[PDB]
PDB file of C-alpha atoms and ligand atoms in Angstrom:
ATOM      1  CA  UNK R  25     108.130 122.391 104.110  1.00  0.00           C
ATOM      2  CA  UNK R  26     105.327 122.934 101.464  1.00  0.00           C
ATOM      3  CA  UNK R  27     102.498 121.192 102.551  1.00  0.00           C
ATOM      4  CA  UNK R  28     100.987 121.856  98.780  1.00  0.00           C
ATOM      5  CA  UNK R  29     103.667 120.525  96.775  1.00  0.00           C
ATOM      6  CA  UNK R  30     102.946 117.517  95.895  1.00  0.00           C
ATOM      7  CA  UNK R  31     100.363 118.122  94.138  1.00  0.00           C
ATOM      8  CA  UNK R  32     102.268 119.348  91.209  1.00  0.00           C
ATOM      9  CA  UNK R  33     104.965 116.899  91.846  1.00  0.00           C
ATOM     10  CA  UNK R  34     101.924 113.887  90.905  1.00  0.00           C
ATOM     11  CA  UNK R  35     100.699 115.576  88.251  1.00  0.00           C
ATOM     12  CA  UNK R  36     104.417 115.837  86.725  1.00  0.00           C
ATOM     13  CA  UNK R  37     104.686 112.395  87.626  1.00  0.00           C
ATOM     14  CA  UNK R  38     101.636 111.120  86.357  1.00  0.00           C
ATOM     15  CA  UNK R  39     103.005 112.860  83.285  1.00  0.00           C
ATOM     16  CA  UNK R  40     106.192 110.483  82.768  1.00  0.00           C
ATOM     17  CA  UNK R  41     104.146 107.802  83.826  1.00  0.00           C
ATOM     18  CA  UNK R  42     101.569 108.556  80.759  1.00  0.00           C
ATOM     19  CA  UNK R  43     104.823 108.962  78.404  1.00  0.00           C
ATOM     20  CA  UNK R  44     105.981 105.441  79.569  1.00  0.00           C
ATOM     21  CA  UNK R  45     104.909 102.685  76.757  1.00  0.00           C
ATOM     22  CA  UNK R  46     104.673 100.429  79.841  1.00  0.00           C
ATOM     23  CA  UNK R  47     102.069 102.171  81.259  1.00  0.00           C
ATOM     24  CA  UNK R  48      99.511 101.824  77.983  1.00  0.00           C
ATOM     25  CA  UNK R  49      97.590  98.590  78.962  1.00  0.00           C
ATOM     26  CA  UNK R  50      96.818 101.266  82.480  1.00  0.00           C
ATOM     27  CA  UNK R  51      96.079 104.842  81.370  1.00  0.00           C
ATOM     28  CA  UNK R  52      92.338 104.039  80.722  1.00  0.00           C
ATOM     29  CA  UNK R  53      89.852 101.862  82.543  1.00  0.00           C
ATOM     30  CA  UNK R  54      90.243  97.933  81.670  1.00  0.00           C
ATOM     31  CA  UNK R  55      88.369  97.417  78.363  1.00  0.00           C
ATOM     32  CA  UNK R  56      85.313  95.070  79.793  1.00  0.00           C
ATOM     33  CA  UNK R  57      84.187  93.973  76.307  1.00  0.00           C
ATOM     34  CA  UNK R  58      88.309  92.651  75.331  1.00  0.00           C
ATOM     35  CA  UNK R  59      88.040  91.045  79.220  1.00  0.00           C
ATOM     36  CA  UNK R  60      84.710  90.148  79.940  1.00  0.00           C
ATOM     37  CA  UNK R  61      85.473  88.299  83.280  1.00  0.00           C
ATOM     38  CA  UNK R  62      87.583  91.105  84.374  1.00  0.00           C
ATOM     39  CA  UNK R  63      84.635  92.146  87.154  1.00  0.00           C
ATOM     40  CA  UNK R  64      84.600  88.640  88.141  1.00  0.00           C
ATOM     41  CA  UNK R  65      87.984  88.604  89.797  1.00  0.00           C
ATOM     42  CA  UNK R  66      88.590  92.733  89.957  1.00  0.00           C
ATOM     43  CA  UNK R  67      86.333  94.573  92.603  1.00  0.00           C
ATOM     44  CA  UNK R  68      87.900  97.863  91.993  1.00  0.00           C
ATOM     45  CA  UNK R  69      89.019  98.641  88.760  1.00  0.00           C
ATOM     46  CA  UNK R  70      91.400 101.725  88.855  1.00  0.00           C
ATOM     47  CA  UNK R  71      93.486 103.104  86.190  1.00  0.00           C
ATOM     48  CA  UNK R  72      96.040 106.387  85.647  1.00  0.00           C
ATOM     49  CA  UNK R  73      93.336 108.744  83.852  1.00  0.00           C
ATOM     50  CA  UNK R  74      91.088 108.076  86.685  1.00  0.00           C
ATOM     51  CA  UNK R  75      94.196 108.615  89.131  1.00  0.00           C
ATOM     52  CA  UNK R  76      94.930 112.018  87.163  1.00  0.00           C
ATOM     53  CA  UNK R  77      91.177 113.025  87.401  1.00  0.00           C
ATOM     54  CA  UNK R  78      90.469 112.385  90.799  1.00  0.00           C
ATOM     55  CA  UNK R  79      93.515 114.701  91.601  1.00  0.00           C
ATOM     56  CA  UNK R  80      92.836 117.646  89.148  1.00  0.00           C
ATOM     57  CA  UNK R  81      89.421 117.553  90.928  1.00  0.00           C
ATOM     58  CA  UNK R  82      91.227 117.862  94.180  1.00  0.00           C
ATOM     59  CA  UNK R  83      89.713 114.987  95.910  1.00  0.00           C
ATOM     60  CA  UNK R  84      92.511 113.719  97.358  1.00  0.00           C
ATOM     61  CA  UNK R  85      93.707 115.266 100.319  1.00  0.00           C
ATOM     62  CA  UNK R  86      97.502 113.648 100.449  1.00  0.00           C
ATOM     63  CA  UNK R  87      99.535 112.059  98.213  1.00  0.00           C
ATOM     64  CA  UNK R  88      99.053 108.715 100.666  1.00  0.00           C
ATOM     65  CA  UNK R  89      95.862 108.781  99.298  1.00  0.00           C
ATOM     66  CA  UNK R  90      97.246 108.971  95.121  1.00  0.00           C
ATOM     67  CA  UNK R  91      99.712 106.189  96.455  1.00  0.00           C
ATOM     68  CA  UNK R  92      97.057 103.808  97.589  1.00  0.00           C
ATOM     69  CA  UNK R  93      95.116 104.590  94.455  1.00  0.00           C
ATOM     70  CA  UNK R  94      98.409 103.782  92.156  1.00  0.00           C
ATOM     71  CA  UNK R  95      98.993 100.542  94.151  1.00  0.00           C
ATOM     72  CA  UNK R  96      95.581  99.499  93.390  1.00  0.00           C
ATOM     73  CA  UNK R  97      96.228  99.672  89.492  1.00  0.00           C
ATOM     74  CA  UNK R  98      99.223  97.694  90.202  1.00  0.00           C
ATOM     75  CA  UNK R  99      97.393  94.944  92.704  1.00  0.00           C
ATOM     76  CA  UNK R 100      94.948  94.295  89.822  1.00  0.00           C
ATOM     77  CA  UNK R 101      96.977  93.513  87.376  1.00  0.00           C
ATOM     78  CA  UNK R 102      98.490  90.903  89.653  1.00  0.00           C
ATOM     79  CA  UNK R 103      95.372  89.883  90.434  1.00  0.00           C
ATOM     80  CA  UNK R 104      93.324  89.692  86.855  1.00  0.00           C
ATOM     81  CA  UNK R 105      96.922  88.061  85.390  1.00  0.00           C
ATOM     82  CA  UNK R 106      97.100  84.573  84.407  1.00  0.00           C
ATOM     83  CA  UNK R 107     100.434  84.563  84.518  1.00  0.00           C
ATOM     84  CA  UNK R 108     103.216  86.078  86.192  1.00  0.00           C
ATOM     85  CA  UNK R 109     105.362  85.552  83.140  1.00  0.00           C
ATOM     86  CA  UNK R 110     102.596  87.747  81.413  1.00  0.00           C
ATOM     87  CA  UNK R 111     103.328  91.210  78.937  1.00  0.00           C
ATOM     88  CA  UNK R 112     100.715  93.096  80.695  1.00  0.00           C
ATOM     89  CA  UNK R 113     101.964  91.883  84.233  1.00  0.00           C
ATOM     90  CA  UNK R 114     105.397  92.434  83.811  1.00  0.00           C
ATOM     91  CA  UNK R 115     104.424  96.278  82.239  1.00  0.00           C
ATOM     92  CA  UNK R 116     102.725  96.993  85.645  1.00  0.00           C
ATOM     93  CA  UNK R 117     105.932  95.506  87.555  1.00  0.00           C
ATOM     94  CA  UNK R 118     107.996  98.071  85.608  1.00  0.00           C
ATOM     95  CA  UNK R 119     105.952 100.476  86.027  1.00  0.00           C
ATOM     96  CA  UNK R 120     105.242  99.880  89.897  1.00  0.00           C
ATOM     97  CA  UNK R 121     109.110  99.943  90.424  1.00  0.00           C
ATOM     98  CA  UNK R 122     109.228 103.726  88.212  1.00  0.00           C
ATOM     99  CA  UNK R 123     106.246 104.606  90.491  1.00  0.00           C
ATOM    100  CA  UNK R 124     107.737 103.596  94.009  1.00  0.00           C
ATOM    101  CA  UNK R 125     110.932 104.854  92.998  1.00  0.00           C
ATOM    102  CA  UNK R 126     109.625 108.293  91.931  1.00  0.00           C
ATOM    103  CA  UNK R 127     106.945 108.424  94.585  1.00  0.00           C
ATOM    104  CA  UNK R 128     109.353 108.137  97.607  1.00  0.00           C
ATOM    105  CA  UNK R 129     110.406 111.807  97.756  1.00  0.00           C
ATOM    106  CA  UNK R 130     107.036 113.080  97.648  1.00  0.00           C
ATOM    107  CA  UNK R 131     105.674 111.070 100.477  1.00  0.00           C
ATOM    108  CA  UNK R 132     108.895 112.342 102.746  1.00  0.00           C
ATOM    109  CA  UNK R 133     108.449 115.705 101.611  1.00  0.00           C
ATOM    110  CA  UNK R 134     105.288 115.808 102.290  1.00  0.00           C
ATOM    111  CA  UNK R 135     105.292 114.217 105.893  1.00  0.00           C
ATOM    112  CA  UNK R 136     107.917 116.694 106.723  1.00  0.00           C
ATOM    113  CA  UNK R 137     106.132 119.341 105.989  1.00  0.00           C
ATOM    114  CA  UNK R 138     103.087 118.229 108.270  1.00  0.00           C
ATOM    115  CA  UNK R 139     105.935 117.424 110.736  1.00  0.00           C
ATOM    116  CA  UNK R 140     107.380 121.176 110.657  1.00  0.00           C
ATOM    117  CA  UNK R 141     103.370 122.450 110.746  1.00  0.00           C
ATOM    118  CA  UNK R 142     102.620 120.920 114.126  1.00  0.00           C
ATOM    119  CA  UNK R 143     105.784 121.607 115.403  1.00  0.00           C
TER     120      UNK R 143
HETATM  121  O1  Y31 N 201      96.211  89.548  79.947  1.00  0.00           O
HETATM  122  C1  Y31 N 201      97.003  89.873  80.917  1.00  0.00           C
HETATM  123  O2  Y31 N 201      98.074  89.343  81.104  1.00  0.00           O
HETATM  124  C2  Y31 N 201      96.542  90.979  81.802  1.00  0.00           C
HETATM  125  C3  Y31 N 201      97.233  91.323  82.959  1.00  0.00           C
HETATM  126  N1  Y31 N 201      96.884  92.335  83.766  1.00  0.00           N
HETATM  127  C4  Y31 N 201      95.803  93.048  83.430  1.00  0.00           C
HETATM  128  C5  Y31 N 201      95.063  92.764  82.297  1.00  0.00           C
HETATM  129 BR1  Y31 N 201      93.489  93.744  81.903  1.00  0.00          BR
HETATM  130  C6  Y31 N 201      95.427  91.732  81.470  1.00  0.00           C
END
């Protein structure tokens, strides 16, 4: 019933995640000079190192809040692809499925512990 703890559980997630080779083409903001359309299709661009920042800097206020961040690396990949078949695409399906997987426990943890509080 820590109400705190996920913190450090993202940031040690976020820390496999960066370790992951599948999560390379993600860790930094899209390259706009390799993908010069990429602002074209992508309104949002979001990547892990921004993820990691914005938490260190404690601006977010629940892990619901990482999650939807996380998601929205994922989403744009899917998005910006040309393909579904694609190497980058396919890295951020692997990865999402790592990430949902991992991210599961956290979000329970968390909502019980904000359950127990207001009881
Ligand atoms: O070239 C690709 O397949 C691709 C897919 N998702 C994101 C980016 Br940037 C590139």
């Amino acid at each position: 019933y820590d109400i705190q703890a996920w913190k450090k559980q993202c940031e040690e997630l976020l820390n496999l995640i960066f370790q992951c080779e599948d999560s390379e083409p993600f860790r930094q903001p899209v390259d706009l000079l390799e993908y010069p359309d990429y602002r074209d299709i992508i309104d949002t661009p979001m990547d892990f190192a921004t993820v990691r920042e914005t938490l260190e800097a404690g601006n977010y206020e629940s892990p619901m809040e990482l999650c939807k961040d996380v998601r929205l690396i994922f989403s744009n990949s899917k998005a910006y692809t040309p393909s579904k078949r694609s190497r980058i695409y396919s890295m951020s399906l692997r990865l999402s499925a790592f990430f949902e997987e991992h991210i599961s426990s956290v979000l329970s943890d968390y909502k019980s512990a904000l359950r127990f509080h207001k009881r």
